[PDB]
Design a protein around this ligand. Structure first.
Ligand SMILES: *[B@@]1([C]([C][C][C][N]C([N])=[N])[N]C(=O)[C]([C]C2=[C][C]=C([C][N])[C]=[C]2)[N]C(=O)C2=[C][C]=[C][C]=[C]2)O[C][C]([C][O])O1
Length: 204
């Protein structure tokens, strides 16, 4: 029922609009993957697609008997598709002529990958501006540039971006100036003034 469509290259854009703000907010993370203001599962082996694993940025689409809608987005790097867990909850994804089955995910970290282990090892350097590759439903892909702030958790810190986009943009990748994916958009908190702030969702 769900499929992926390639829609952009993974790149830094020199003309991106600069927006957002660099906040600092105290949060805790629950075992369902929700942040509040203040583990990993290896999936079944296919066992016996061939989906398309071309590098790039992708929309996650779904449909029933009528038109389609955009459930989310993600990134294909080194033959593995990466998204937030909550976009698909582990559902299989068609990719071109074949199927991609989940490999590994964590509800609490809100991360899921298909085709192999997580390939994205780069992280925000804690200093520089970053770019979100915005995969908004119904719209062409564009990049926006921002300086992250920080979620302060009881154990540590996580980079966080004050950028609000509509439902279905979750899983859009965030890149550093080299064009390396430093994490994904779409799991955060709402502030008392209504501002939405997402973690830069990434492994170690
Ligand atoms: B995303 C969507 C992108 C941001 C939309 N903007 C906004 N809500 N103002 N992300 C969210 O809405 C997430 C969803 C989510 C789902 C599941 C988990 C793990 N249990 C965590 C987050 N919501 C928030 O981050 C949120 C936190 C606190 C209060 C309100 C909202 O695009 C496709 C999918 C839709 O679920 O996500």
């Amino acid at each position: 029922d769900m499929w992926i469509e390639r829609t952009a290259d993974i790149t830094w854009e020199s003309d991106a609009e600069i927006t957002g703000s660099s906040e600092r907010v105290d949060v805790r993370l629950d075992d369902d993957g929700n942040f509040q203001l203040m583990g990993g599962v290896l999936w079944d082996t296919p066992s016996p697609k061939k989906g398309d694993t071309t590098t790039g940025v992708y929309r996650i689409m779904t449909r029933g008997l009528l038109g389609s809608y955009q459930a989310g987005a993600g990134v294909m790097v080194e033959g593995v598709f990466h998204t937030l867990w909550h976009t698909t909850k582990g559902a299989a994804l068609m990719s071109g002529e074949g199927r991609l089955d989940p490999y590994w995910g964590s509800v609490k970290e809100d991360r899921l990958c298909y085709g192999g282990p997580w390939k994205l090892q780069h992280k925000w350097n804690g200093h520089d501006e970053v770019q979100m590759i915005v995969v908004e439903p119904g719209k062409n892909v564009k990049n926006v540039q921002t300086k992250p702030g920080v979620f302060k958790t009881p154990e540590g810190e996580i980079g966080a971006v004050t950028l609000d986009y509509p439902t279905g943009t979750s899983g859009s990748p965030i890149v550093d100036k080299n064009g390396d994916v430093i994490g994904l958009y779409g799991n955060g908190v709402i502030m008392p003034n209504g501002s939405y702030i997402s973690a830069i969702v990434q492994g170690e």
